[PDB]
Design a protein around this ligand. Structure first.
Ligand SMILES: *[C@@H]1O[C@H](CO)[C@@H](O[C@@H]2O[C@H](CO)[C@@H](O)[C@H](O)[C@H]2NC(C)=O)[C@H](O)[C@H]1NC(C)=O
Ligand SMILES: *[C@@H]1O[C@H](CO)[C@@H](O)[C@H](O)[C@H]1NC(C)=O
Length: 536
């Protein structure tokens, strides 16, 4: 008789509870009156009187559960009421406990593959529906199995085969068979991460891959410039979506973490979807959180000296009273070498690790820290040891020490050491032999025509007396330099004796600072060599 009308809904057929929905009856013949039928019954009637148009609206504001069901549209032209538009199933979510949807292994799927998702729910007699967020809505319906241990009803969906052209976003629903038009509120969006075949995004970690706990860090995913959304993922276990990306320079998907915890460490990969579909995943960037296991801090030492000559063998010692599995050295903020198995020494009650370095390339110069961690948690490290710094000399002119303020000192005289050189080094390093610390200062350009470095030590005590050496380096250079002749600092007033012989060794010095005392007169001993006491 007459052209069957077209019934449309906004928003979609599956609407969340308590939201406004609108039906639209459309035709071209005429518009005398429109009628909306709900489940085979006259629900509403809109007349084109009191503005004249060709399409009629039916608003159902504040939708509740009772508004779910079949809807048809009929119209009348002249005095002919004509048939029905093909029915439209309005579905309302709510009334139930929210189901859970879990990527059974991981959301990761190489294109053309299937992933299994488990959908759980507490409801006794319920069917499960898995839908994907796409144009032509893909659905799957399963019966619920019951896990007697967890006392929960679950069903598994094998969603696939996953095509690399379309973004896959899965959601689950639970619903009673007897009332099909009423589903549960949708579970959390499970988005599948597809390993495409386009170029790989470079993944980066700006502050570093090693981060102390509770601190901030950022993960960048830069790559193809026809990319739209960047993802970060962990083997165990994360999903993160970035839509708003820095366009300058080029698509840079930024991720920000305010404070690092246990659940932020692990191996990260960057997945990416774009106009030409998905891309091959990034390299596995391993994020490491330290500061955890903050009870037993490891301790780091070095032998034979914190400063070794170029081309020598030198061992670092990572030790801890706690039975860690492995110890790892880090230079600056970066990992160094690899992990070594801990080794329980029977004598020192310690767990030991000997990082042997030989020969010493100028690359080993830096600040080392040893961490302890366990096998089952490779990304959760201990609290860093007190730093042990390494200097490596060998290849430049030996920068002599001025050694002013005298050569033999009495507590307490403000001792300062100057380290000069003919070669214009941009930085000098002073070291007291047998010590663990190395001092460094920016050299100042004196008028004469070279650089002098000021090393202001504290008040002279009995402990400040020893042997000193200075080293020189440039700005662009990572190579430190061979040290000068040893400076022997001698301290007085450290023995209850006054010499009258002018006791293994005997010292003799001028009232003025001589270039070197020979071995007023002073008296020392072979064991405690740098300690003296006299009056003449
Ligand atoms: C580097 O250290 C020397 C210390 O020898 C400083 O020299 C002072 O110089 C004044 C005159 O210029 C002398 O009267 C003082 O006796 C010196 N100090 C001492 C402790 O002897 C020099 O100023 C320092 N230079 C820089 C750039 O810090
Ligand atoms: C170990 O280092 C020392 C000095 O650094 C060197 O003389 C010695 O030859 C090294 N050991 C071996 C086996 O070469």
């Amino acid at each position: 008789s007459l052209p069957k009308p077209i019934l449309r809904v906004q928003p979609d057929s599956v609407v969340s509870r308590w939201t406004k929905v609108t039906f639209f009856c459309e035709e071209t013949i005429g518009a005398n009156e429109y009628r909306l039928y709900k489940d085979g019954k006259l629900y509403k009637t809109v007349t084109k009187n009191k503005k004249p148009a060709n399409k009629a609206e039916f608003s159902l504001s504040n939708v509740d559960l009772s508004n779910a069901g079949q809807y048809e549209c009929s119209y009348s032209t002249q005095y002919k009421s004509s048939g029905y538009s093909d029915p439209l199933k309005l579905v309302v979510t709510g009334h139930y406990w929210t189901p859970s949807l879990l990527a059974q292994a991981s959301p990761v799927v190489t294109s053309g593959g299937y992933v299994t998702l488990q959908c759980e729910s507490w409801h006794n007699d319920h069917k499960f529906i898995l839908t994907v967020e796409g144009p032509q809505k893909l659905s799957w319906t399963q019966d619920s199995q019951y896990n007697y241990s967890t006392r929960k009803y679950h069903a598994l969906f094998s969603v696939g085969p996953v095509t690399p052209n379309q973004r896959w976003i899965c959601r689950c629903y639970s619903y009673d068979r007897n009332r099909p038009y009423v589903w549960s509120p949708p579970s959390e969006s499970v988005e599948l991460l597809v390993s495409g075949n386009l170029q790989k995004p470079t993944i980066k970690a700006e502050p570093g891959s090693v981060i102390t706990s509770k601190r901030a860090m950022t993960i960048w995913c830069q790559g193809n410039l026809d990319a739209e959304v960047y993802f970060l993922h962990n083997e165990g276990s994360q999903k993160t979506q970035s839509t708003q990306t820095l366009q300058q320079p080029g698509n840079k998907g930024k991720f920000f973490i305010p404070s690092m915890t246990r659940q932020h460490a692990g191996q990260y990969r960057c997945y990416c979807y774009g106009s030409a579909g998905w891309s091959q995943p990034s390299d596995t960037l391993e994020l490491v959180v330290t500061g955890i296991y903050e009870h037993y801090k490891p301790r780091l030492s070095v032998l034979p000296s914190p400063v070794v000559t170029a081309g020598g063998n030198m061992t670092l010692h990572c030790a801890s009273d706690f039975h860690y599995d492995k110890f790892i050295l880090t230079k600056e903020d970066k990992k160094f070498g690899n992990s070594l198995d801990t080794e329980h020494i029977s004598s020192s009650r310690q767990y030991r690790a000997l990082f042997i370095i030989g020969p010493t390339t100028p690359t080993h110069t830096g600040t080392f820290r040893c961490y302890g961690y366990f096998k089952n948690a490779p990304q959760l490290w201990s609290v860093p040891s007190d730093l042990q710094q390494i200097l490596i000399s060998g290849l430049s002119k030996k920068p002599s020490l001025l050694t002013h303020q005298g050569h033999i000192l009495d507590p307490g005289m403000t001792l300062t050491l100057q380290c000069y050189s003919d070669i214009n080094y941009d930085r000098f390093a002073l070291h007291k032999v047998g010590g663990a610390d190395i001092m460094q200062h920016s050299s100042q350009q004196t008028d004469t025509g070279f650089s002098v470095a000021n090393f202001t030590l504290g008040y002279v005590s009995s402990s400040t007396g020893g042997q000193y050496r200075c080293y020189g380096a440039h700005n662009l250079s990572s190579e430190w330099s061979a040290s000068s002749e040893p400076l022997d600092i001698l301290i007085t007033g450290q023995l209850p004796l006054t010499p009258s012989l002018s006791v293994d060794t005997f010292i003799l010095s001028k009232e003025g600072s001589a270039q070197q005392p020979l071995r007023r007169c002073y008296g020392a001993q072979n064991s405690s060599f740098y300690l003296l006491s006299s009056a003449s």
